[PDB]
Amino acid sequence: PNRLLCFSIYVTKKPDQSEEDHHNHVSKVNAPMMIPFLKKYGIVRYTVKHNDAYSKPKQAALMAGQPEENVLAYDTVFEMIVKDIESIQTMQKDEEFLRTTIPDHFNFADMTRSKGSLTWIEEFTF
C-alpha cells in the first residue's frame, strides 16, 4: 500500500468576524462549494476541524494544567487526504475553482495568518 498524503490548511478567521459567522460560513457555504471539486480531482477524504464555542470548553477541560500558550489558536483546519499532490495542483488550476472559491475566502479567512502543511500519514481505524 502506497503512503497517503495529508494537505492541511490552518485558517484564522477575520478579526471582526464572530466565531459563529466564521464556522457557519465554512460549513454552510464553503464546504458545499468545495466538495464537487474535491471529488472531481480525486481527493480521497476531506475533514473540517472546528475550534469554536462548541469545542472550546471541552478543549479547556482536556488541556487543563497545560499552559494556554500550548493550545493551537486556529479557528478552522481543512485536511485533504490525497494519493499525490498532483490532485491538489490540478484542482487549484481549475478556472471555475479559482473564480468561485477564491472570492469566497474573503468571507471567512484572514489570509495573512494562514499556514499549511503536507505530511505523509499512518492511519489506524479501530
Next chain:
Amino acid sequence: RLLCFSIYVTKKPDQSEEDHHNHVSKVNAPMMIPFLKKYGIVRYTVKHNDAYSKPKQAALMAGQPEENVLAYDTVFEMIVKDIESIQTMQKDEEFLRTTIPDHFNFADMTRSKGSLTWIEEFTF
C-alpha cells in the same frame, strides 16, 4: 459530533529527523495503540513531516513564504466521541508507567502544542 485531539510534536533538540520518525513509527505509535483501543479512541493518525514528504511539501507550497509552512515534525490525531476517553487513559497508571518515559526519546515537550476540535468528515 466527533472530536479530534491533535498533538503537535517538535522532535528532541539534537535528534535526527530519521531517528525521530523511526522511533515514532516503530516504537511509540505501536506502544500507544493498545491503550487507545482500550479507552475507545475511534481512529488514530500519525502525520510525518520528514524527508519523504518534504520535497512534495516544498513543491506544493511553492509561491508561499517559508514561514507559512507548519514546522512540526510529527502530528498525532486521536478521534474520540468524548474527552473523557483521553482523560481516563491519562489516568491509567499502567499507561503512565509504560509510555511517559518514552516521550523523552522523541519529543521536545517544551515546544509541543495541542488542539481539541469538533470535525465534519467527507469520504468520496
